[PDB]
Symmetry: D2
Subunit: 253 residues, 4 copies
C-alpha cells in the first residue's frame, strides 16, 4: 500500500529492469502502464499482473508518446510517476568505429525519449505533485571502455535530471535518477553472447562488483518505489544501485 | 513488515533524526534499541513505542558500547542493523577560533563513536548478514562555512563508510551512509536560538533547499529503512537527503 | 617554453574563453590554429599573435573539420593538442519552452562538434602522444536553472571525456576536461543584456562564487596549458575553474 | 620564474612526493622550507638545492610547528604557500585488527598536523594573499581495502579543504587539495616489501591505472606549482593525479 491509488508509467517495461520496476510498483499498490516498442514481453506482463496494462509506444516517436500520456489519463484519470527506463547499450565499439549518425540515434533513444515523455507528462505530474525517475547508469559518472556514445548519453541523463529538478522544485515535482551498475537482464545476456568467450565475459561482469554478483531488476525496482513513495525530501539525486563497483581499485614510467 | 523479525540499534535515538529513525524502524516491524547519552527523550520513547527499548550509552565510552552490544544480544538474540546517528554540530566557529583539542573531541564523537560501535557489532552483523548505516552530512561533500572541525568529521565518516564497505563485502555485510542536508531537529533549533536573528537564520536555512523547506527526521528514517531492508545491491553509497541543496547556484577582478 | 615545438588547435578561439586559451598556448611557446565559425575575432587574433593562425571552420560541418585537421598537418607537420571549446549557452528557457529540435541542435554544437574534431584528430594525436582538452561546464555536474538542454550537453561532454580517456589510455593519449563556472566573456555579456535588469544579473553572477568575482579567459587558458604540458599522469579528470561556486550553501513542511 | 620571489613551506619534504614538490617549487623560482621529522633526506636536499633550506619539525608537535612558521618568517620575511604533505599509510589492516588508539594517532599526523600548520600560517598567508595546498588521496573519495583509518583521515582532509576554502575566500586565500593515486615513493616501496609477493604487489599497483604505470613525485609537484602560481580562480578543488584509477571497471545471486 506504499503507493496505493497512484498511477505510474514505465517505459521499456516489457523486460529487464523495466519489467522489474513494473512489478515493484504493482506490488506497492499502484496501477502501472507498461510502455514498450515491442509487444511480446509487455503484453504477457499485462495478462500476468492485475493492475498493469500495456500500451505499444516507441519513445522516439513523439506521437506515440503523446498518445501514451493521453491514454494513461483517459483510462486512469491521473499520473503520479514516470519512470524513463527505455534505452539501449550498443555492442562494445572502439571510438574510431563509432559514427556521428549512430551517436545521434542513440541520443534519440537514451536522452531525447526521456526528455519527450517527461515534457508531455509534467503538466499532469504538477497536478498530482508527482515525480520523475530516470534510469541513467553508473558509467555516465565513471566512464566505460568501448562505449563513448552510450557513456555520453547517460552523462546527459544524469545532468538533465539535476537541471529539471531545479526547474520543477517550485511546482512540487521531484526529479531523480537511478544509476545501476551491472544488472542481469536480457540485454546483458544478448551482449555477452556476442563475445568470443561469453561465460568469461559474464564472470568478469559479476566480479566487477565487491558484492561478487550482478544486480537484479527487482533491486532497481525497489529503489524506484522508494524514490516515488518515500523520498519526499530527495530531488536531483543519483541513486547508485551498483554493488559497489565504483569503489576501490582493480614502475613510474 | 518490511523489516519484521530484525533487531536494530540506533545511536543518539532519543530525539531529532535518531528518534525519527527509531520510529521508522518500529513501523517497519523491527525491534529497536535506542542508545543515547541522555535519559530524557529515549526513556519516553521506550514507553511510547512497543518494540523499542532504551539503553543509556555514551558512544565515546568504549565500555558503554561493549555493554550496548552485549545487552542487545542478551535481550533480543540477534543484531541486524546499526545506525550510527549520534553526533553534534558545534556553534559556528571561525577557523582561528577552533582548537586542536576541540577538534579531537568532535572527532571522538562524530567519527570514533561510529567506528567503535561498528567494530563491536560487526561479528553479529556477519552472522545475520546485517548492515551498517552511518549518518554523515552533505557538508562533508560540499563544505560549510564556520565549521572546519564538523566538516572534517563528516568527510571522514563518508570515506570510512566506503572503506568498510569494501572490507565487509566478502562477508555479506553492506555498509552505507545517509548525508542529510538541513533537517529540522532540536539541534537546529538550539543553534538558531544563539544567532542574533534566530528567525532570519531559520528562514535562510529553509531557503537553502530548492524544495523551500527543511527536511524531517521521518524522511531520514524512511531512507534508513530502505537501506536496511530493500537496498540489497547497495554498499558504500552516500544517500543524499538534502532537498536539492547541492544543486544549482546561490566583474572578473 | 613549457609547450615549445607543439601544435594546438583551439575551436571557438576567436573570442571569450577560446581566445584566452589561444593566448595562453602562444605564451607557452606553441603554434596555435584558431578555429571559429566567425571571421571577425579570429582573423584579428591571427594578426596580433605571431604563432597563431586562423582557419574558418564550423565544428558542426564535418567537411569543415576534416579540412581543419588536414590544413593543420599540411601547414605545421604535427598535431599535439585539441581544445574543444566551441559551444553556446542559449538564453534561459523554462523546460516547457524547450523543443526536441532545439535540443538536437545544441547537441550538434556542444557535443557532436567536440566528438567530430576529436575523432579526426586522434590518429595524429596518437603519433605525437598528444592530448585532448574538452571545455565542459560546472553546471553539467550540479545543474543550472532554466537550462535543461545546455546542462544535458555538458553532462555528456564530461562523461564522454572519461570514456575516451579509458579507450585512448593504451595509446598514450590523455583526454581531460575543464569545467568552468561563471567566466566573464562576450557570451556572458550578451545574455546579461537580455535580462530585465542586466547589472543586477551580472552582480548576482559575481556573487555566486565565494571568491566574489567571475573568472577570466586567461585563467581557463592557464588550466589548459597545465593539462597539455605538465599533467602527464592526469587522464579523464574534470578540472574545476569555478571560484568555489560548487561549495557551500546559498520549517520542515 | 612562475613563482619567483615567493616563499613555500613543504611538510614531509625530505623524500617521496614532498621532495618532488620541493624540487618543483625551487625550479619555479621560489624559496622553499623543507620540513621533516627525519634529518636524512631533507638535510641532503638543502645541500643539493640552492633556494631550499631544511628545518627539523614534527607536524604533530605544536611547538615544532610554531617554530617552523616563526623561523620561516625570520629568515625569509614572508610566507606565500604551505603544502601539507606529511602523512603516512600504515600497512594493510583488516578492520577488526585496527584500534581506536591507532586511529587517533593516524588522525594526529594525517589530519591534525595539516590543521595545525595551516592555522599558524594563515595570518601570514592573508598578508601575502597566499594559498594552502593539502595532499589528500584518491582513496578518500573511492575507498581502499584494508585501510579504514587511512581512508577516513583523507576523507577528512578533502572535506576540511572545502570548509576552509569557504572561510578564507573573503580574505583572498585559496585552499585546494591534490588527491594522488598510486605514486612510486619510498613509502610505496616499503609497504610492497612487506607483502608476501612484493613484485606482484608492485605490478598490480602499476596496472590499477589505465595509464599502466604509477605516478611520479615530480608530477604531483607540477600540480602543486600550478595550484600555487596559476590557479587564481580555483579554491576548494580536489585535483586528481591518479592516472585514471577512478575510471572504469576492474549471475545475480
Ligand atoms: N542492464 C544493465 O546492466 C544496465 C546498467 C545500467 C543502466 N542500464 C539502463 O537500464 C535500462 C534498461 O536496460 P535493460 O538492461 O533492462 O535493457 P533491455 O534491453 O533488457 O530492456 C529494455 C527494454 O526497453 C525497450 N525499449 C527499447 N527501445 C525502446 C523504445 N524506443 N521505446 C520503447 N521501449 C523501448 C525494449 O524493447 C526492452 O523491453 C536502459 O536505460 C539501460 O541503459 C542497464
Ligand atoms: N539536523 C541536521 O540538519 C543535520 C544535517 C546533517 C547531518 N546531521 C547529523 O545527524 C545526526 C543527528 O543530528 P540531530 O540534528 O538529530 O541532532 P540532535 O542534537 O537533535 O540529536 C542528537 C542526539 O544524539 C545524542 N547524542 C549526542 N552525543 C551522544 C553520545 N556521545 N552518545 C550517545 N548519544 C549521543 C543526543 O543526546 C541527542 O539525543 C548527527 O550525526 C548530525 O551530525 C544533522
Ligand atoms: N562563459 C562562461 O561562464 C562559461 C562557463 C562554463 C563553460 N563555458 C563554455 O566555454 C566555451 C566558450 O564559452 P564563451 O563564454 O567563451 O562563449 P563565446 O560565445 O564568448 O565564445 C564562443 C566562441 O565559439 C565560436 N563558435 C560558436 N559556435 C561555433 C561553431 N559551430 N564552430 C566554431 N566556432 C564556433 C563563436 O563564434 C565564439 O567565437 C563554451 O563551450 C561554453 O559552453 C562557458
Ligand atoms: N605514495 C602514494 O601512492 C600516495 C598516494 C596518495 C596520497 N599520498 C600522500 O602523499 C603524502 C606523501 O606520501 P609519500 O608516499 O611521499 O610518503 P613517504 O613516506 O615516502 O614520505 C613522507 C615524508 O613525510 C615525513 N613525515 C612523516 N611524518 C612526519 C611528521 N610527523 N612530521 C614531519 N614530516 C613527517 C617522512 O619523514 C617522509 O620524509 C602523504 O600525505 C600520503 O598520504 C601518497
Ligand atoms: O548494457 C550493458 C551495460 C553494462 C553496465 C552498465 F553500467 C550499463 O549502463 C550498461 C552491457 C551488458 C553487457 C556487456 C556490456 C559491455 C561489455 C564490454 C564493453 O566494452 C562495453 O562497453 C559494454 N555492457
Ligand atoms: O547542525 C547543523 C547542521 C546543518 C546542516 C548540516 F548539513 C549539518 O550536518 C548540520 C546546523 C544547525 C543550525 C545552524 C547551523 C549552522 C549555521 C551557520 C554556520 O556557519 C554553521 O557552520 C552551521 N548548523
Ligand atoms: O553562458 C552562461 C553560462 C554560465 C555559467 C556556466 F557554468 C556556463 O556553462 C555557461 C551564462 C551567461 C550569462 C547568463 C547565464 C544564465 C542566467 C540565468 C539562467 O537561468 C541560465 O540558465 C543561464 N548563463
Ligand atoms: O601508501 C600507499 C597508498 C596507495 C594509494 C593511495 F592512494 C594512497 O593514498 C596511499 C600504499 C603503498 C603501497 C601499498 C599500499 C596498500 C596495499 C594494499 C592495501 O590493502 C592497502 O590498504 C594499501 N598502499
Ligand atoms: O536474461 C537475464 C535475466 O533477465 C531478467 O530480466 C530476468 O528477470 C531473468 O529471469 C533473466 O535471467
Ligand atoms: O525542535 C525541532 C523539531 O525537532 C524534531 O525532531 C521534532 O520531531 C519536531 O517536533 C520539532 O519541531
Ligand atoms: O565581454 C566580456 C569580456 O570578454 C572577455 O573575453 C574579454 O577578454 C574582456 O575584455 C571582456 O570584458
Ligand atoms: O623509492 C621509490 C622512488 O621514490 C621516489 O621518491 C624517488 O624519486 C625515486 O628515485 C624512487 O625510485
Ligand atoms: Na493486467
Ligand atoms: Na517500548
Ligand atoms: Na599570427
Ligand atoms: Na640550499
Amino acid at each position: 500500500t506504499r503507493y496505493a491509488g497512484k498511477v505510474v508509467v514505465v517505459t521499456g517495461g516489457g523486460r529487464g529492469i523495466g519489467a522489474g520496476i513494473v512489478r515493484a510498483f504493482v506490488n506497492s499498490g499502484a496501477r502501472v502502464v507498461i510502455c514498450d516498442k515491442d509487444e511480446s514481453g509487455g503484453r504477457a506482463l499485462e495478462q500476468e499482473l492485475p493492475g498493469a496494462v500495456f500500451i505499444l509506444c516507441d519513445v522516439t516517436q513523439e506521437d506515440d508518446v503523446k498518445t501514451l500520456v493521453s491514454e494513461t489519463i483517459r483510462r486512469f484519470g491521473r499520473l503520479d510517476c514516470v519512470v524513463n527506463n527505455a534505452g539501449h547499450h550498443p555492442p562494445p565499439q572502439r571510438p574510431e568505429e563509432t559514427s556521428a549518425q549512430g551517436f545521434r540515434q542513440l541520443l534519440e533513444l537514451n536522452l531525447l525519449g526521456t526528455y519527450t515523455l517527461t515534457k508531455l507528462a509534467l503538466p499532469y505530474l504538477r497536478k498530482s505533485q508527482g515525480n520523475v525517475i530516470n534510469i541513467s547508469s553508473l558509467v555516465g559518472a565513471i566512464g566505460q571502455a568501448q562505449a563513448v556514445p552510450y557513456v555520453a548519453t547517460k552523462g546527459a541523463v544524469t545532468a538533465m535530471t539535476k537541471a529539471l529538478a531545479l526547474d520543477e522544485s517550485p511546482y512540487g515535482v521531484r526529479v531523480n535518477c537511478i544509476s545501476p551498475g551491472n544488472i542481469w537482464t536480457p540485454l546483458w545476456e544478448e551482449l555477452a553472447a556476442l563475445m568470443p568467450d561469453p561465460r568469461a565475459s559474464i564472470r568478469e561482469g559479476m566480479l566487477a562488483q565487491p558484492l561478487g554478483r550482478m544486480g537484479q531488476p527487482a533491486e532497481v525496482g525497489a529503489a524506484a518505489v522508494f524514490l516515488a513513495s518515500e523520498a519526499n525530501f530527495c530531488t536531483g539525486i543519483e541513486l547508485l544501485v551498483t554493488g559497489g563497483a565504483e569503489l576501490g581499485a582493480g614502475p613510474d614510467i
